[PDB]
């Protein structure tokens, strides 16, 4: 349970975030973040940096969002990064065919006048929804007679709609491009520079914290389905012969909710497991994937996501290996962090397309295309050299993948530098062995969707007080609260301000983010306002603080609203240790006088 309406009202009112271009009617899937929201987001990102980039000594890079077409063609985004879309024929309103058909089905299955066998049929359709191609989906649309859910009219046949934002780089029409749909490709393109930076050694990891774009058909669902979004993505390159993480024992004792592919197939439920046990039993393939899963868990819980509403779902054979961190919200289980485990065929693709060897290189202890120069020479004269040097760099996965088509269809076609070439029995294969080893690195890909993580934290930390007027507050951990300490002085009189100034300065010296409250009203109402945005602690300075000696102020805990009274010069250290988790509120109450004034 979560009062989404009330929470959303608080989020819009205190301006954590709001619909972008609101005064222009707004734009779907686009959101502006306000001061408090920006503070929270910056805290999220900083905590993320110190977690991952700092603990793992990750190589951070910042690539461009603007990406020329060939780069995203080579990566398969031009051909495969799309959603099936259907159009109303009367007005033309676009719909994502997936969720539309799914809606129609989930509706019909839940109808009294419907047979058991058909309900079965439809369960069968849903549990295979992602395998369906264009024609299959068209047939499915016809056979279930799917109409528009607003107008009830007929729908155009499903057609592939690419989700990348299209544009043009330069003033001609010769460099068409896209806004990047992910930040991984920029890391892959810089793989050589990064490997060099790491003195040629494996393993290593690169990270990027920046925006990505996705021309979502019809965004609803708030922050969950957006068109422009900030991602925190790690690419961990490891030797496939070295799938063992030296630091796995640090997270091996963690107890996580795991939702295996087998459990999903067999209608089973997720189960709590020790991470080490899960790896030991082959639920999680290796300890690199396991390690990163564990630290993803630790990060998510650190920023305020509830453990009882957090699970890790493995991807089924139709969605290589991939575990997603999923949180339970009012929109149901949503993916917030992806974590792929796979051979980096990306490096191979870009290597072929650019003729630049993107490969690791390990020395050992001293343990193929066979073209016809003549036929290619006659076919493509001066361009034969290019076909040749293309072929001389292709890796075994590709020599295989094209050997198949060389057999079956008796062809297989490439494209290099300029354009394309149809190779047909101008080729052959070579064998034997010899010999430094070429290492095509496996990659673990943790992909953090900061917006969804933030919204999850919103839903998991939102609470209401007891009163007739339902005062709301956010149980933000101090590490991500917009700021940690509110300083509430009673007056502006120039004998108060020295205390306020000293308190602020000391708070800054102690690394406690704070803010002096110059707001209007009763103490409890001001504290209600600061609670409303999830500020963790409060220090109120009254007349007794100023005029009586020793000078003591009141420390108030956000969650409990309970207070103590302490020497104002000691409060920065207390708030520091509180926020850093060095001491509990109970530890503070046990050493300082209680205070309900």
Binding-site residue set for ATP: 214-216, 225-226, 335-336, 452
Main-chain dihedrals φ then ψ at residue 302, nearest 5 degrees: -65, -35
| C-beta separation of 78 from 265 below 8 A | no
| Complex with a second copy: residue 178 or 412, whichever CB lies closer | 178
Concatenate the DSSP letters of all residues of 435-504 into one string. Answer: --EEE--EEEEEEEEHHHHHHHHHHHHEEE-SSSS--EEE---TTTSS-SEEEEES---TTTHHHHHHHH
Binding-site residues sit at 182, 214-216, 225-226, 233, 335-336, 445-447, 452
Of 41, 48, 54, 53, which Cα lies nearest the Cα of 481? 41
Token pair 């549990």 is found at 127
| Complex with a second copy: residue 42 or 249, whichever CB lies closer | 42
CB of residue 176 to a second copy, shortest distance in Å: 11
Footprint of a second copy on this chain (CB under 8 A)?
Answer: 15, 18, 20-24, 27-28, 30-35, 37-39, 41, 59-68, 70-71, 85, 92, 94, 161, 165-172, 175, 179, 186, 189-190, 192-194, 197, 199, 211, 213, 215, 217-218, 227-228, 350, 353-354, 356, 358, 511, 519-520
Query: Residue 57 carries which DSSP code?
Result: T
| C-beta separation of 426 from 412 below 8 A | no
CB of residue 578 to a second copy, shortest distance in Å: 18
| Complex with a second copy: residue 208 or 327, whichever CB lies closer | 208
Residues 433-454 as b/e (b if ≥16 CB within 10 A, e otherwise) read eeeeeebbbbbbbbbbbbbbbb
| Complex with a second copy: residue 207 or 322, whichever CB lies closer | 207
CB of residue 459 to a second copy, shortest distance in Å: 21
CB of residue 315 to a second copy, shortest distance in Å: 27
**Residue 447 to residue 183: CA distance in whole angstroms:** 9
CB of residue 162 to a second copy, shortest distance in Å: 10
Of 252, 319, 294, 323, which Cα lies nearest the Cα of 55? 294
Of 368, 377, 439, which Cα lies nearest the Cα of 403? 368
CB of residue 252 to a second copy, shortest distance in Å: 22
| Complex with a second copy: residue 79 or 518, whichever CB lies closer | 518
Of 53, 33, 536, which Cα lies nearest the Cα of 299? 53
| Complex with a second copy: residue 164 or 322, whichever CB lies closer | 164
**Residue 445 to residue 205: CA distance in whole angstroms:** 10
CB of residue 111 to a second copy, shortest distance in Å: 31
Alpha helices in 248-286 (DSSP H): 261-265, 275-280
| Complex with a second copy: residue 228 or 426, whichever CB lies closer | 228
CB of residue 595 to a second copy, shortest distance in Å: 29
Binding-site residues for glycine sit at 182, 233, 445-447
| Complex with a second copy: residue 97 or 146, whichever CB lies closer | 97
Radius of gyration of the chain (CA): 29
Pairing of strands 59-60, 204-213: parallel
């Amino acid at each position: 349970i979560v009062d989404r309406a009330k929470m959303g009202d608080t989020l819009k009112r205190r301006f954590f975030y709001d619909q972008a271009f609101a005064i222009y009617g707004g734009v779907s899937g686009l959101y502006d973040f306000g001061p408090v929201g920006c503070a929270l987001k910056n805290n999220i990102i900083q905590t993320w940096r110190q977690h991952f980039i700092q603990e793992e000594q990750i190589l951070e890079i910042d690539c461009t969002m603007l990406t020329p077409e060939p780069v995203l063609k080579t990566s398969g985004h031009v051909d495969k990064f799309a959603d099936f879309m259907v159009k109303d024929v009367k007005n033309g309103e676009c719909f994502r065919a997936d969720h539309l058909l799914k809606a129609h089905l989930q509706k019909l299955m839940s109808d009294k006048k419907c047979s058991v066998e058909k309900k079965s049929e439809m369960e069968s359709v849903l549990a295979q929804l992602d395998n369906y191609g264009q024609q299959e989906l068209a047939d499915l649309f016809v056979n279930y007679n799917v109409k528009s859910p607003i107008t009830g009219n007929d729908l155009s046949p499903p057609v592939s709609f690419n989700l990348m934002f299209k544009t043009f780089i330069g003033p001609g029409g010769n460099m068409p491009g896209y806004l990047r749909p992910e930040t991984a490709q920029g890391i892959f393109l810089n793989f050589k520079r990064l490997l060099e930076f790491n003195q040629g050694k494996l393993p290593f990891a690169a990270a990027q914290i920046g925006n990505s774009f996705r021309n979502e058909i019809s965004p609803r669902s708030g922050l969950i389905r957006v068109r422009e979004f900030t991602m925190a993505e790690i690419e961990h390159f490891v030797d496939p012969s070295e799938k063992d993480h030296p630091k796995f024992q640090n997270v091996a004792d963690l107890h996580l909710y795991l939702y295996s592919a087998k459990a999903q197939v067999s209608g089973q439920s997720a189960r709590k497991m020790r991470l080490g046990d899960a790896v030991e039993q082959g639920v999680i393939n290796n300890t690199v994937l396991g390690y990163f899963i564990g630290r993803i868990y630790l990060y998510l819980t650190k920023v305020g996501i509830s453990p009882d509403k957090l699970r890790f779902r493995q991807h089924m054979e139709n969605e290589c290996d991939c575990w997603d961190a999923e949180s339970k919200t009012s929109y149901g289980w949503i993916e917030i962090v992806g974590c792929a485990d796979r051979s980096c065929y990306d490096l191979s693709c870009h290597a072929r397309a650019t003729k630049v060897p993107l490969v690791a290189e390990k020395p050992l202890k001293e343990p193929q295309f066979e073209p016809s120069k003549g036929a290619i020479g006659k076919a493509y004269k001066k361009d034969a050299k290019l076909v040749m040097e293309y072929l001389a760099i292709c890796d075994e996965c590709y020599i295989t993948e094209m050997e198949m088509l060389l057999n079956e269809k008796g062809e297989f076609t490439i494209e290099t530098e300029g354009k394309t070439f149809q190779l047909t029995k101008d080729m052959i294969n070579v064998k034997r062995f010899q010999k430094v080893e070429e290492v095509v690195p496996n990659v673990i890909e943790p992909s953090f969707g900061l917006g969804r993580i933030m919204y999850t934290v919103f839903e998991h930390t939102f609470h209401v007080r007891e009163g007739d007027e339902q005062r709301t507050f956010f149980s933000f951990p101090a590490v991500v609260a917009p700021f940690k300490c509110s300083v509430l002085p009673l007056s502006q009189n120039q004998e108060f301000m020295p205390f306020v100034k000293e308190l602020s300065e000391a708070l800054t010296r102690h690394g406690v983010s704070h803010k002096v409250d110059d707001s209007s009203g009763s103490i409890g109402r001001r504290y209600a306002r600061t609670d409303e945005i999830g500020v963790a602690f409060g220090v109120t300075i009254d007349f007794d603080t100023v005029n009586k000696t020793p000078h003591t102020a009141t420390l108030r805990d956000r969650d409990s609203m309970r207070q103590i009274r302490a020497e104002i010069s000691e409060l920065p250290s207390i708030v520091q240790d509180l926020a850093n988790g060095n001491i509990t509120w109970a530890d503070v109450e046990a050493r300082y006088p209680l205070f309900e004034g």
